[model samples]
Target: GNSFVGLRVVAKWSSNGYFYSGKITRDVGAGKYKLLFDDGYECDVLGKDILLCDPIPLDTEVTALSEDEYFSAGVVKGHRKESGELYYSIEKEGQRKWYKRMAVILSLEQGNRLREQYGLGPY
Candidate 1:
Protein backbone atom coordinates (compact mmCIF):
# COMPACT_ATOMS: atom_id res chain seq x y z
CA GLY A 1 0.00 0.00 0.00
CA ASN A 2 1.16 3.53 -0.77
CA SER A 3 0.65 5.22 2.56
CA PHE A 4 2.24 8.49 1.51
CA VAL A 5 0.25 9.12 -1.61
CA GLY A 6 -2.22 12.01 -1.42
CA LEU A 7 -0.69 13.23 1.80
CA ARG A 8 0.56 16.76 2.46
CA VAL A 9 4.22 16.87 3.37
CA VAL A 10 7.32 18.93 3.87
CA ALA A 11 10.40 17.92 1.94
CA LYS A 12 13.95 19.16 1.88
CA TRP A 13 14.88 21.04 -1.28
CA SER A 14 18.42 20.31 -2.26
CA SER A 15 18.98 23.66 -3.92
CA ASN A 16 18.81 25.56 -0.65
CA GLY A 17 18.46 22.82 1.96
CA TYR A 18 15.12 24.23 3.11
CA PHE A 19 11.92 22.28 3.55
CA TYR A 20 8.93 23.19 1.37
CA SER A 21 5.27 22.23 1.32
CA GLY A 22 4.14 19.64 -1.19
CA LYS A 23 2.03 16.52 -1.69
CA ILE A 24 2.99 13.00 -2.54
CA THR A 25 1.65 12.13 -5.97
CA ARG A 26 3.29 8.75 -6.54
CA ASP A 27 5.30 6.05 -4.90
CA VAL A 28 8.21 5.83 -7.34
CA GLY A 29 9.71 2.78 -5.71
CA ALA A 30 13.15 2.63 -4.09
CA GLY A 31 11.71 4.60 -1.17
CA LYS A 32 11.10 7.68 -3.32
CA TYR A 33 7.91 9.58 -3.99
CA LYS A 34 6.88 12.05 -6.61
CA LEU A 35 6.19 15.39 -4.97
CA LEU A 36 4.05 18.11 -6.41
CA PHE A 37 5.09 21.24 -4.61
CA ASP A 38 2.54 23.86 -3.69
CA ASP A 39 4.37 26.26 -5.94
CA GLY A 40 3.69 23.86 -8.87
CA TYR A 41 7.01 22.14 -9.23
CA GLU A 42 7.35 18.39 -9.26
CA CYS A 43 10.24 16.16 -8.29
CA ASP A 44 10.99 12.72 -6.99
CA VAL A 45 12.07 13.07 -3.38
CA LEU A 46 13.53 10.43 -1.12
CA GLY A 47 11.54 9.28 1.87
CA LYS A 48 14.20 10.47 4.25
CA ASP A 49 13.81 13.98 2.92
CA ILE A 50 10.10 14.12 3.55
CA LEU A 51 8.08 14.69 6.70
CA LEU A 52 4.33 14.24 6.80
CA CYS A 53 2.31 17.12 8.24
CA ASP A 54 -1.32 17.76 8.90
CA PRO A 55 -2.98 20.84 7.53
CA ILE A 56 -2.62 23.63 10.06
CA PRO A 57 -5.91 25.18 11.03
CA LEU A 58 -6.46 28.90 11.45
CA ASP A 59 -6.35 30.46 14.93
CA THR A 60 -4.08 27.67 16.10
CA GLU A 61 -1.28 28.96 18.28
CA VAL A 62 2.18 28.34 16.88
CA THR A 63 5.70 29.62 17.00
CA ALA A 64 7.43 30.78 13.87
CA LEU A 65 11.05 31.27 13.08
CA SER A 66 11.71 34.85 12.15
CA GLU A 67 14.05 35.90 9.40
CA ASP A 68 16.52 36.69 12.13
CA GLU A 69 16.27 33.03 13.24
CA TYR A 70 14.40 33.74 16.46
CA PHE A 71 11.30 31.76 17.34
CA SER A 72 8.33 33.87 18.41
CA ALA A 73 4.85 33.02 19.55
CA GLY A 74 2.11 33.59 17.03
CA VAL A 75 -1.34 32.57 15.92
CA VAL A 76 -2.08 31.01 12.55
CA LYS A 77 -3.97 33.72 10.78
CA GLY A 78 -4.00 32.19 7.33
CA HIS A 79 -1.91 30.75 4.53
CA ARG A 80 -1.30 31.07 0.81
CA LYS A 81 0.62 29.24 -1.88
CA GLU A 82 3.05 31.12 -4.06
CA SER A 83 6.59 31.30 -5.33
CA GLY A 84 6.79 27.53 -5.33
CA GLU A 85 6.13 27.43 -1.59
CA LEU A 86 3.38 27.51 1.02
CA TYR A 87 3.44 30.57 3.24
CA TYR A 88 1.49 31.09 6.41
CA SER A 89 0.23 34.37 7.77
CA ILE A 90 1.22 34.51 11.42
CA GLU A 91 -0.18 37.04 13.84
CA LYS A 92 2.19 38.20 16.51
CA GLU A 93 1.32 41.03 18.86
CA GLY A 94 -1.32 42.22 16.41
CA GLN A 95 1.21 42.29 13.58
CA ARG A 96 0.92 39.77 10.77
CA LYS A 97 3.90 38.37 8.92
CA TRP A 98 4.24 35.67 6.29
CA TYR A 99 6.38 32.65 7.00
CA LYS A 100 7.17 29.53 5.05
CA ARG A 101 5.26 26.43 6.16
CA MET A 102 8.43 24.83 7.48
CA ALA A 103 9.25 27.93 9.50
CA VAL A 104 6.09 27.59 11.56
CA ILE A 105 6.55 25.13 14.38
CA LEU A 106 3.30 23.26 15.03
CA SER A 107 4.37 22.03 18.47
CA LEU A 108 3.75 24.81 20.96
CA GLU A 109 5.85 23.23 23.69
CA GLN A 110 8.77 22.68 21.35
CA GLY A 111 8.48 26.21 20.14
CA ASN A 112 8.45 27.56 23.66
CA ARG A 113 11.61 25.68 24.50
CA LEU A 114 13.26 27.00 21.36
CA ARG A 115 12.18 30.51 22.26
CA GLU A 116 13.71 30.13 25.70
CA GLN A 117 16.89 28.81 24.20
CA TYR A 118 16.95 31.87 22.02
CA GLY A 119 16.17 34.14 24.97
CA LEU A 120 12.69 35.04 23.79
CA GLY A 121 9.48 35.24 25.79
CA PRO A 122 6.89 32.47 25.96
CA TYR A 123 3.99 32.28 23.60
Candidate 2:
Protein backbone atom coordinates (compact mmCIF):
# COMPACT_ATOMS: atom_id res chain seq x y z
CA GLY A 1 0.00 0.00 0.00
CA ASN A 2 1.26 3.46 -0.87
CA SER A 3 1.39 5.23 2.52
CA PHE A 4 1.98 8.91 1.71
CA VAL A 5 0.33 8.97 -1.69
CA GLY A 6 -1.44 12.33 -1.28
CA LEU A 7 -0.76 13.25 2.32
CA ARG A 8 0.64 16.62 3.33
CA VAL A 9 2.39 17.13 6.66
CA VAL A 10 2.99 20.44 8.42
CA ALA A 11 3.63 21.96 11.83
CA LYS A 12 1.31 23.39 14.43
CA TRP A 13 1.42 24.90 17.93
CA SER A 14 0.23 23.32 21.15
CA SER A 15 0.64 24.04 24.87
CA ASN A 16 4.30 23.22 24.39
CA GLY A 17 6.56 25.01 21.93
CA TYR A 18 6.59 23.52 18.40
CA PHE A 19 5.52 20.23 16.84
CA TYR A 20 4.44 18.82 13.54
CA SER A 21 0.73 19.33 12.90
CA GLY A 22 -1.80 20.16 10.20
CA LYS A 23 -1.36 18.94 6.66
CA ILE A 24 1.02 20.60 4.29
CA THR A 25 -0.75 23.16 2.16
CA ARG A 26 -1.34 21.69 -1.29
CA ASP A 27 -2.02 23.36 -4.67
CA VAL A 28 -0.82 26.60 -3.02
CA GLY A 29 2.62 26.35 -4.52
CA ALA A 30 5.78 25.42 -2.69
CA GLY A 31 6.53 27.87 0.09
CA LYS A 32 7.21 27.95 3.80
CA TYR A 33 5.20 25.25 5.59
CA LYS A 34 3.89 25.96 9.10
CA LEU A 35 4.41 23.20 11.66
CA LEU A 36 3.89 22.51 15.38
CA PHE A 37 6.74 21.92 17.77
CA ASP A 38 6.90 21.80 21.53
CA ASP A 39 8.70 20.24 24.44
CA GLY A 40 6.56 17.10 24.78
CA TYR A 41 5.39 16.93 21.20
CA GLU A 42 7.35 15.44 18.35
CA CYS A 43 6.18 13.96 15.03
CA ASP A 44 7.50 12.11 12.05
CA VAL A 45 6.19 10.85 8.76
CA LEU A 46 7.41 8.31 6.21
CA GLY A 47 11.09 7.95 7.07
CA LYS A 48 11.38 11.24 8.90
CA ASP A 49 10.27 11.99 12.42
CA ILE A 50 9.72 15.63 11.56
CA LEU A 51 8.26 16.75 14.88
CA LEU A 52 9.93 14.26 17.21
CA CYS A 53 6.61 14.12 19.06
CA ASP A 54 6.99 13.48 22.78
CA PRO A 55 3.33 12.44 22.75
CA ILE A 56 0.72 13.44 25.31
CA PRO A 57 -0.19 11.66 28.52
CA LEU A 58 -2.41 8.58 28.56
CA ASP A 59 -5.66 10.42 29.35
CA THR A 60 -5.02 13.20 26.89
CA GLU A 61 -7.18 13.22 23.77
CA VAL A 62 -5.90 14.26 20.35
CA THR A 63 -8.18 15.34 17.55
CA ALA A 64 -6.60 14.91 14.13
CA LEU A 65 -7.40 17.33 11.38
CA SER A 66 -10.55 16.79 9.38
CA GLU A 67 -10.65 15.86 5.71
CA ASP A 68 -9.36 18.68 3.52
CA GLU A 69 -9.49 20.98 6.52
CA TYR A 70 -8.38 23.98 4.47
CA PHE A 71 -4.95 22.39 4.63
CA SER A 72 -3.03 19.75 2.76
CA ALA A 73 -2.05 17.08 5.26
CA GLY A 74 -5.63 16.12 5.94
CA VAL A 75 -6.54 13.37 8.37
CA VAL A 76 -5.03 10.15 7.00
CA LYS A 77 -5.67 7.84 9.93
CA GLY A 78 -8.58 6.33 11.85
CA HIS A 79 -12.21 6.23 10.70
CA ARG A 80 -13.99 9.35 9.48
CA LYS A 81 -16.09 9.77 12.61
CA GLU A 82 -13.21 8.33 14.60
CA SER A 83 -11.06 11.33 13.69
CA GLY A 84 -7.63 9.81 13.17
CA GLU A 85 -5.58 11.54 15.87
CA LEU A 86 -2.31 11.09 17.67
CA TYR A 87 -1.53 10.91 21.39
CA TYR A 88 1.14 9.61 23.74
CA SER A 89 0.56 7.62 26.86
CA ILE A 90 2.65 6.65 29.86
CA GLU A 91 1.02 3.26 30.03
CA LYS A 92 1.53 2.10 26.42
CA GLU A 93 5.03 3.53 26.38
CA GLY A 94 7.01 2.37 23.31
CA GLN A 95 3.94 0.47 22.21
CA ARG A 96 0.70 1.28 20.37
CA LYS A 97 0.01 4.83 21.44
CA TRP A 98 -0.71 8.01 19.56
CA TYR A 99 0.62 8.75 16.08
CA LYS A 100 -0.06 5.09 15.58
CA ARG A 101 -3.34 6.21 14.17
CA MET A 102 -1.62 8.54 11.74
CA ALA A 103 -1.14 7.04 8.30
CA VAL A 104 2.37 8.20 7.62
CA ILE A 105 2.50 9.25 4.03
CA LEU A 106 5.36 8.03 1.93
CA SER A 107 6.38 8.35 -1.65
CA LEU A 108 6.27 5.43 -4.05
CA GLU A 109 10.01 5.58 -4.44
CA GLN A 110 10.43 5.71 -0.71
CA GLY A 111 8.16 2.71 -0.30
CA ASN A 112 10.21 0.84 -2.83
CA ARG A 113 13.31 1.73 -0.94
CA LEU A 114 11.79 0.41 2.28
CA ARG A 115 10.73 -2.79 0.58
CA GLU A 116 14.24 -3.27 -0.69
CA GLN A 117 15.61 -2.55 2.75
CA TYR A 118 13.49 -5.25 4.40
CA GLY A 119 13.91 -7.64 1.47
CA LEU A 120 10.15 -7.51 0.94
CA GLY A 121 9.52 -9.05 -2.44
CA PRO A 122 6.66 -8.81 -4.96
CA TYR A 123 8.28 -5.70 -6.29
Candidate 3:
Protein backbone atom coordinates (compact mmCIF):
# COMPACT_ATOMS: atom_id res chain seq x y z
CA GLY A 1 0.00 0.00 0.00
CA ASN A 2 2.97 2.30 0.37
CA SER A 3 4.40 3.86 -2.77
CA PHE A 4 8.12 3.03 -2.79
CA VAL A 5 9.36 4.67 -5.96
CA GLY A 6 12.79 6.23 -5.65
CA LEU A 7 13.41 4.80 -2.21
CA ARG A 8 16.40 2.70 -1.21
CA VAL A 9 15.51 -0.82 -0.11
CA VAL A 10 16.69 -4.36 0.48
CA ALA A 11 14.75 -6.98 -1.40
CA LYS A 12 14.41 -10.59 -0.50
CA TRP A 13 15.63 -12.74 -3.33
CA SER A 14 13.31 -15.71 -3.67
CA SER A 15 15.93 -17.60 -5.63
CA ASN A 16 18.71 -17.40 -3.08
CA GLY A 17 17.08 -16.45 0.24
CA TYR A 18 19.38 -13.44 0.57
CA PHE A 19 18.48 -9.79 0.82
CA TYR A 20 20.20 -7.49 -1.66
CA SER A 21 20.21 -3.72 -1.76
CA GLY A 22 18.56 -1.75 -4.52
CA LYS A 23 16.22 1.14 -5.25
CA ILE A 24 12.59 1.09 -6.14
CA THR A 25 12.30 2.38 -9.66
CA ARG A 26 8.55 2.15 -10.12
CA ASP A 27 5.39 0.97 -8.48
CA VAL A 28 4.32 -1.77 -10.81
CA GLY A 29 0.93 -2.00 -9.11
CA ALA A 30 -0.83 -5.04 -7.73
CA GLY A 31 1.44 -4.96 -4.68
CA LYS A 32 4.61 -5.23 -6.75
CA TYR A 33 7.44 -2.81 -7.45
CA LYS A 34 10.33 -2.69 -9.88
CA LEU A 35 13.80 -2.73 -8.43
CA LEU A 36 17.17 -1.69 -9.80
CA PHE A 37 19.74 -3.72 -7.92
CA ASP A 38 23.16 -2.30 -7.07
CA ASP A 39 24.84 -5.02 -9.09
CA GLY A 40 22.95 -3.76 -12.18
CA TYR A 41 20.17 -6.27 -12.29
CA GLU A 42 16.50 -5.28 -12.51
CA CYS A 43 13.42 -7.18 -11.48
CA ASP A 44 9.87 -6.79 -10.25
CA VAL A 45 9.23 -7.82 -6.68
CA LEU A 46 6.34 -7.97 -4.29
CA GLY A 47 6.06 -4.96 -2.01
CA LYS A 48 6.04 -7.27 1.01
CA ASP A 49 9.44 -8.56 -0.02
CA ILE A 50 11.16 -5.19 0.22
CA LEU A 51 12.37 -3.44 3.31
CA LEU A 52 13.13 0.30 3.38
CA CYS A 53 16.63 1.32 4.42
CA ASP A 54 18.50 4.53 4.97
CA PRO A 55 21.73 5.46 3.24
CA ILE A 56 24.85 4.82 5.27
CA PRO A 57 26.37 7.98 6.69
CA LEU A 58 29.73 9.14 5.43
CA ASP A 59 32.81 8.52 7.60
CA THR A 60 31.05 5.68 9.38
CA GLU A 61 32.92 2.46 9.85
CA VAL A 62 31.49 -0.38 7.83
CA THR A 63 32.02 -3.91 6.64
CA ALA A 64 31.73 -4.33 2.91
CA LEU A 65 30.68 -7.44 1.09
CA SER A 66 33.42 -8.06 -1.42
CA GLU A 67 33.00 -9.61 -4.82
CA ASP A 68 34.25 -12.83 -3.33
CA GLU A 69 31.30 -12.59 -0.89
CA TYR A 70 33.55 -12.04 2.09
CA PHE A 71 33.04 -9.29 4.65
CA SER A 72 35.93 -6.88 5.21
CA ALA A 73 36.26 -3.80 7.39
CA GLY A 74 36.15 -0.36 5.80
CA VAL A 75 34.92 3.20 6.20
CA VAL A 76 32.38 5.12 4.22
CA LYS A 77 34.18 7.99 2.55
CA GLY A 78 31.58 9.31 0.11
CA HIS A 79 28.20 8.70 -1.41
CA ARG A 80 26.41 9.39 -4.64
CA LYS A 81 23.04 8.68 -6.15
CA GLU A 82 22.67 8.33 -9.87
CA SER A 83 19.39 7.65 -11.61
CA GLY A 84 17.84 6.54 -8.32
CA GLU A 85 20.67 4.15 -7.55
CA LEU A 86 22.71 4.63 -4.36
CA TYR A 87 26.45 4.01 -4.16
CA TYR A 88 29.00 4.45 -1.41
CA SER A 89 32.73 4.94 -1.67
CA ILE A 90 34.46 2.81 0.94
CA GLU A 91 38.12 2.84 1.94
CA LYS A 92 39.78 -0.37 3.05
CA GLU A 93 43.45 -0.93 3.64
CA GLY A 94 44.21 2.50 2.14
CA GLN A 95 42.35 1.61 -1.04
CA ARG A 96 38.99 3.04 -2.01
CA LYS A 97 36.22 1.60 -4.11
CA TRP A 98 32.55 2.32 -4.66
CA TYR A 99 29.90 -0.17 -3.66
CA LYS A 100 26.15 -0.35 -3.62
CA ARG A 101 24.56 0.64 -0.32
CA MET A 102 23.29 -2.89 0.17
CA ALA A 103 26.82 -4.25 -0.16
CA VAL A 104 27.86 -2.13 2.82
CA ILE A 105 26.98 -3.17 6.33
CA LEU A 106 26.33 0.15 8.11
CA SER A 107 26.97 -0.64 11.76
CA LEU A 108 30.47 -0.58 13.18
CA GLU A 109 29.57 -3.23 15.73
CA GLN A 110 27.88 -5.47 13.21
CA GLY A 111 30.61 -4.79 10.71
CA ASN A 112 33.36 -5.76 13.06
CA ARG A 113 31.48 -8.90 13.97
CA LEU A 114 31.19 -9.81 10.32
CA ARG A 115 34.84 -9.02 9.70
CA GLU A 116 35.79 -11.20 12.62
CA GLN A 117 33.68 -14.02 11.25
CA TYR A 118 35.47 -13.57 7.96
CA GLY A 119 38.84 -13.49 9.67
CA LEU A 120 39.50 -9.82 8.89
CA GLY A 121 40.83 -7.38 11.49
CA PRO A 122 38.42 -4.89 12.95
CA TYR A 123 38.25 -1.38 11.57
Q: Model 2, range 77-109, lDDT digits (tens) per residue?
A: 222223544532212223332233342322333
Per-model CA lDDT versus the true structure: 0.66, 0.29, 0.66
1 versus 2: better TM-score goes to = 1
- Superposed by TM-score, candidate 1 places the C-alpha of residue 104 at a distance from the truth, in angstroms, of 6.3
Off by over 4 Å in 1: 56-123
* Model 1: per-residue Cα lDDT over 1-123, one tens digit each: 436678886665667554556788998987778999866889987776665545455776776765675757788888898977778898988899988875775342432332322311121
Report the lDDT of model 1 for residue 12.
53
Model 1: per-residue Cα lDDT at residue 35: 90
Q: In candidate 3, what are the lDDT values of residues 1-123, reduced to their tens digit? A: 665578876665567545567788997777788889877989987765665546655676766786764777788899989888778888888998888666875333432332322311121
Runs in model 2 lying further than 4 Å from the true structure: 1-17, 27-30, 34-85, 91-123
* lDDT, residue 100, candidate 1: 81
Per lDDT, what order, best first?
3, 1, 2
TM-score of 2: 0.23
